[PDB]
Structure formats: structure tokens, C-alpha cells
Paper text:
Periplasmic binding proteins (PBPs) are a class of proteins that participate in the cellular transport of various ligands. The structurally symmetric bilobal architecture of their fold has long been thought to originate from a duplication and fusion event of an individual lobe. Here, the crystal structures of two permuted halves of a modern ribose-binding protein (RBP) from [name] are reported.
RBP-CPN was designed to consist only of the βA–Eα1–4 elements, which are directly linked to α9. Similarly, RBP-CPC consists of the elements βF–Jα5–8 connected to α4 of RBP by permutation. An alternative explanation could be the formation of an interface between two crystallographic dimers, as indicated by an analysis with the PISA server. In this case, the C-terminal α8 would not originate from the same chain of the asymmetric unit but from its corresponding symmetry mate. The resulting extended arrangement is facilitated by an interaction of the βI strand and the residue stretch 116′–120′. The central β-sheet as well as all α-helices appear to be well ordered, except for the loops close to the unresolved region and the termini. The r.m.s.d. of 0.5 Å over 135 Cα atoms of the resolved residues, however, indicates a high similarity between RBP-CPC and the corresponding elements of full-length RBP. However, it appears that RBP-CPC, which still contains this corresponding helix 8, does not reliably form a dimer.
Numbering used by the authors:
A (entry chain B): 1 to 97, 115 to 142
B (entry chain A): 1 to 95, 115 to 142
């Protein structure tokens, strides 16, 4: 039933962080089977994402996926999963590159659609 | 030895959030005994802070203090601490090439946070 996941946020003071995450959540939050059990900044950085993911894996072992606000954080997350033997966890991300929406928000929307479609196929009810 | 704490940030897209937090950290980060174990927006909102703090207290029972980017969040955090029986936790709050008023308010709040907590928890 439930698909628990974690999210790695970018730098909290940087607008791309909010736009990517908000776009992602505009989609994923419509599918209540997806449960965000952890959400933390990894500062758009690979080494920080490794450290943060290592901690998330210990506190929330049930996660099936991690969505990341840039490629560097996804790479660090993937390394941490490998180091923990958690090669089962799926890693996703969007790297980019106010009234209305922009590039980072729409990219988060499309990334969220893919995240839902992929994970509902792997983990149907 | 160490003094773990949590920070409740304002609305992430609002510049006062960052001026206040950056001024606070310009002081606190110089003192290595203070360790920020959780940092999360509570949207400058009391009821959001209540819910966010309830979650932080369960993930990070080691915390001895919470610093908040406005009064509304401090009040929500205080209520959450009471609800969890954690009346031991101290709550604090305050309500770009140059520096501005919110930054200097954060600096003064951080100086007070350090002084107060170092008197409560001396080496």
C-alpha cells in the first residue's frame, strides 16, 4: 500500500530549492499512498547528501525511494545507499538548466509525474 | 558538554527569515559546544510550529533549546514542549552586502542565546 520516501532539499535560502520541491509536491501530494517520511536539506552538495542520507537510512529504513533537488545530492544519496547495502532504494532527481511558474517548478512537476508513474508500477496496491 | 538545539525558520522565501537566522548563526556557530541537530521552517506560524516541534522532539530528544525566527513560532514550540512533558527545553526567538535590522536582531539574539545557555550549562 504505502510507498515511503525521503526528499533531499537544496540550499534552503535558494529559490530553485523551493521551486523544484513545490513542483514535485504539486504532483506527488495528490497520491496519498506516497508518504514523505523524511525531508532535509543536503545543500545541493554531494558530500552533504551522503551524510544526510546515511542518517535518514538509519532512522527511516523503510524508505523505497529518495527524490533529490539536484544531481549532486542524488549522487551522494546513491553512494550512501550503496554503502548501506540498500541497493533496492530508487534514486531520482532534477538538476534544472513570484507570480506564475518557472523552469524549476515545471521541471519538478514533470519529475514528480515520472516518480509517481515509475513507483506505482514497481509498488502497485 | 554539547548543547544540542533546533532552529525554526520563517517562511523560506521571505528575506527576514534569512537575515534573522544568518545573524543568529554568525554568533552561535563560533561556539562549538552548540550543535544544531534540526532546522526546519515553521512558516512564521504558531500552529505550524506546534506540529513541526512535536515531530522534532521525537526525532531529536537530545535538544536542550529551540531558537525561533519569530514570536508566533516560539509560542507554538513552547506549547508543543509542554504537551510532550519537555518543560526543561528553553525557547528563544526574535520578532545582501550590508546588514539590516533583522540581521542585527539575530546577532543580539544569538549572543543572548549563548550567554544564557552557557550559564545554565557551564563547562
Amino acid at each position: 500500500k504505502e510507498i515511503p520516501y525521503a526528499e533531499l532539499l537544496g540550499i534552503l535560502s535558494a529559490q530553485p530549492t523551493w521551486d523544484r520541491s513545490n513542483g514535485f509536491h504539486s504532483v506527488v501530494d495528490q497520491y496519498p499512498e506516497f508518504k514523505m517520511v523524511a525531508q532535509q536539506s543536503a545543500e545541493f552538495d554531494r558530500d552533504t547528501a551522503y551524510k544526510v542520507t546515511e542518517q535518514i537510512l538509519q532512522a527511516h529504513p523503510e524508505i523505497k525511494a529518495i527524490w533529490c533537488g539536484n544531481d549532486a545530492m542524488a549522487l551522494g544519496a546513491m553512494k550512501a545507499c550503496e554503502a548501506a547495502g540498500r541497493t533496492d532504494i530508487y534514486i531520482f532527481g532534477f538538476d534544472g538548466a513570484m507570480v506564475g511558474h518557472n523552469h524549476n517548478y515545471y521541471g519538478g512537476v514533470l519529475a514528480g509525474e515520472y516518480f509517481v508513474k515509475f513507483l506505482k508500477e514497481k509498488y502497485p496496491d
